[PDB]
Design a protein around this motif. Structure first.
Motif, PDB file in Angstrom:
ATOM      1  N   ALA A   3      -5.210  -1.215  -0.232  1.00 46.17           N
ATOM      2  CA  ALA A   3      -5.014  -2.497   0.424  1.00 46.17           C
ATOM      3  C   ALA A   3      -5.360  -3.633  -0.525  1.00 46.17           C
ATOM      4  N   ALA A   4      -4.622  -4.732  -0.423  1.00 49.97           N
ATOM      5  CA  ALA A   4      -4.869  -5.884  -1.272  1.00 49.97           C
ATOM      6  C   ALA A   4      -6.030  -6.709  -0.721  1.00 49.97           C
ATOM      7  N   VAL A   5      -6.369  -7.788  -1.423  1.00 42.84           N
ATOM      8  CA  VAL A   5      -7.405  -8.703  -0.950  1.00 42.84           C
ATOM      9  C   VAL A   5      -6.835  -9.488   0.227  1.00 42.84           C
ATOM     10  N   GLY A   6      -7.362  -9.236   1.420  1.00 42.75           N
ATOM     11  CA  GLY A   6      -6.878  -9.842   2.639  1.00 42.75           C
ATOM     12  C   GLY A   6      -6.175  -8.882   3.571  1.00 42.75           C
ATOM     13  N   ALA A   7      -5.757  -7.722   3.078  1.00 47.55           N
ATOM     14  CA  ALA A   7      -5.068  -6.750   3.905  1.00 47.55           C
ATOM     15  C   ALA A   7      -6.055  -6.000   4.797  1.00 47.55           C
ATOM     16  N   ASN A   8      -5.509  -5.307   5.782  1.00 47.93           N
ATOM     17  CA  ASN A   8      -6.314  -4.572   6.751  1.00 47.93           C
ATOM     18  C   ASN A   8      -6.872  -3.302   6.120  1.00 47.93           C
ATOM     19  N   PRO A   9      -8.194  -3.169   5.976  1.00 46.33           N
ATOM     20  CA  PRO A   9      -8.750  -2.021   5.255  1.00 46.33           C
ATOM     21  C   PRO A   9      -9.017  -0.809   6.130  1.00 46.33           C
ATOM     22  N   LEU A  10      -8.394  -0.762   7.310  1.00 45.02           N
ATOM     23  CA  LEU A  10      -8.712   0.257   8.306  1.00 45.02           C
ATOM     24  C   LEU A  10      -8.320   1.654   7.843  1.00 45.02           C
ATOM     25  N   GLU A  11      -7.100   1.811   7.334  1.00 45.68           N
ATOM     26  CA  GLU A  11      -6.610   3.105   6.885  1.00 45.68           C
ATOM     27  C   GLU A  11      -6.446   3.173   5.378  1.00 45.68           C
ATOM     28  N   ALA A  12      -7.055   2.252   4.646  1.00 51.36           N
ATOM     29  CA  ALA A  12      -7.059   2.307   3.198  1.00 51.36           C
ATOM     30  C   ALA A  12      -8.253   3.116   2.705  1.00 51.36           C
ATOM     31  N   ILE A  13      -8.225   3.442   1.418  1.00 55.26           N
ATOM     32  CA  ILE A  13      -9.337   4.092   0.749  1.00 55.26           C
ATOM     33  C   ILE A  13      -9.989   3.164  -0.268  1.00 55.26           C
ATOM     34  N   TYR A  14      -9.192   2.396  -0.996  1.00 54.02           N
ATOM     35  CA  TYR A  14      -9.708   1.419  -1.935  1.00 54.02           C
ATOM     36  C   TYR A  14      -9.076   0.065  -1.653  1.00 54.02           C
ATOM     37  N   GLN A  15      -9.800  -0.992  -2.002  1.00 53.25           N
ATOM     38  CA  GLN A  15      -9.337  -2.350  -1.762  1.00 53.25           C
ATOM     39  C   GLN A  15      -9.879  -3.253  -2.854  1.00 53.25           C
ATOM     40  N   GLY A  16      -9.005  -4.054  -3.447  1.00 53.74           N
ATOM     41  CA  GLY A  16      -9.442  -4.947  -4.499  1.00 53.74           C
ATOM     42  C   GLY A  16      -8.281  -5.758  -5.018  1.00 53.74           C
ATOM     43  N   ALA A  17      -8.590  -6.600  -6.005  1.00 54.14           N
ATOM     44  CA  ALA A  17      -7.584  -7.471  -6.595  1.00 54.14           C
ATOM     45  C   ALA A  17      -6.584  -6.710  -7.452  1.00 54.14           C
ATOM     46  N   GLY A  18      -6.924  -5.504  -7.888  1.00 57.62           N
ATOM     47  CA  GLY A  18      -6.018  -4.712  -8.687  1.00 57.62           C
ATOM     48  C   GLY A  18      -5.431  -3.544  -7.928  1.00 57.62           C
ATOM     49  N   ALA A  19      -5.336  -3.664  -6.606  1.00 58.83           N
ATOM     50  CA  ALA A  19      -4.855  -2.563  -5.788  1.00 58.83           C
ATOM     51  C   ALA A  19      -3.341  -2.449  -5.762  1.00 58.83           C
ATOM     52  N   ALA A  20      -2.620  -3.391  -6.368  1.00 62.54           N
ATOM     53  CA  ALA A  20      -1.174  -3.251  -6.460  1.00 62.54           C
ATOM     54  C   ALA A  20      -0.797  -2.184  -7.479  1.00 62.54           C
ATOM     55  N   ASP A  21      -1.524  -2.123  -8.592  1.00 64.39           N
ATOM     56  CA  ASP A  21      -1.244  -1.192  -9.671  1.00 64.39           C
ATOM     57  C   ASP A  21      -2.087   0.073  -9.590  1.00 64.39           C
ATOM     58  N   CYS A  22      -2.509   0.473  -8.397  1.00 59.20           N
ATOM     59  CA  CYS A  22      -3.178   1.752  -8.231  1.00 59.20           C
ATOM     60  C   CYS A  22      -2.183   2.816  -7.802  1.00 59.20           C
ATOM     61  N   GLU A  23      -2.448   4.045  -8.229  1.00 54.31           N
ATOM     62  CA  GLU A  23      -1.517   5.142  -8.031  1.00 54.31           C
ATOM     63  C   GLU A  23      -2.299   6.421  -7.805  1.00 54.31           C
ATOM     64  N   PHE A  24      -1.822   7.241  -6.880  1.00 55.21           N
ATOM     65  CA  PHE A  24      -2.294   8.610  -6.803  1.00 55.21           C
ATOM     66  C   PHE A  24      -1.781   9.395  -8.003  1.00 55.21           C
ATOM     67  N   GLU A  25      -2.585  10.348  -8.461  1.00 55.59           N
ATOM     68  CA  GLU A  25      -2.104  11.325  -9.426  1.00 55.59           C
ATOM     69  C   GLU A  25      -1.826  12.673  -8.779  1.00 55.59           C
TER      70      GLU A  25
END
Lengths: 49, 84
Positions: A6-28
Motif C-alpha cells: 500500500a502507498a502512503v495514504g492507502a488502506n493498510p488493512l490487507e497490505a503487508i508493507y506500506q511506505g513511500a517506495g511501495a510502488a516499486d516493491c515486488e514479490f519474488e
C-alpha cells in the motif's frame, strides 16, 4: 503485487508493507506447505466405528 | 468387510452407460465333422531296434574231441633185488 504493498495514504488493512517506495516493491517467491493433522488408529466396536 | 462411514455414507450403484448388450453375447461356434486323413500304413521302418540288448559279452564254447589214443614205450624200472 496488488494487495500487499500500500502507498502512503492507502488502506493498510490487507497490505503487508506500506511506505513511500511501495510502488516499486515486488514479490519474488511464495512457498506454501500444508500439513494435515488427523487421528488414526480409530476404535471399532461390534457395530463398526 | 469395510466399515460404514456414518458421517459420509453412500448408496448403492446407479445406472451408467452400457456396452451394447448383444456385443457381450457370443455365438456358439458351430463344429463341422472331421477326419484323420489318409490310409495309414501298418508298420514303420524304425531307426532303432525294438528288442533288448546285452550289457556284457559272455564267452561261448563248443566241445571238441582229442584223437585216437596210442600206446607208449615206457622206460621201465629195475628189479627190486633189495636195492631200492
Amino acid at each position: 503485487n496488488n494487495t500487499a504493498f500500500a502507498a502512503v495514504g492507502a488502506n493498510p488493512l490487507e497490505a503487508i508493507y506500506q511506505g513511500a517506495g511501495a510502488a516499486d516493491c515486488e514479490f519474488e517467491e511464495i512457498s506454501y506447505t500444508v500439513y494435515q493433522s488427523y487421528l488414526d488408529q480409530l476404535p471399532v466396536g461390534q457395530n463398526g466405528y | 468387510m469395510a466399515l460404514i462411514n456414518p458421517q459420509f455414507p453412500y448408496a448403492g450403484p446407479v445406472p451408467i452407460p452400457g456396452p451394447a448388450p448383444t456385443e457381450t453375447m457370443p455365438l456358439l461356434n458351430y463344429r463341422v465333422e472331421g477326419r484323420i486323413a489318409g490310409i495309414q500304413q501298418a508298420r514303420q521302418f524304425m531307426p532303432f531296434l525294438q528288442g533288448p540288448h546285452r550289457e556284457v559279452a559272455e564267452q561261448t564254447y563248443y566241445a571238441i574231441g582229442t584223437g585216437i589214443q596210442m600206446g607208449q614205450t615206457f622206460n621201465q624200472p629195475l628189479i627190486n633185488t633189495q636195492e631200492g
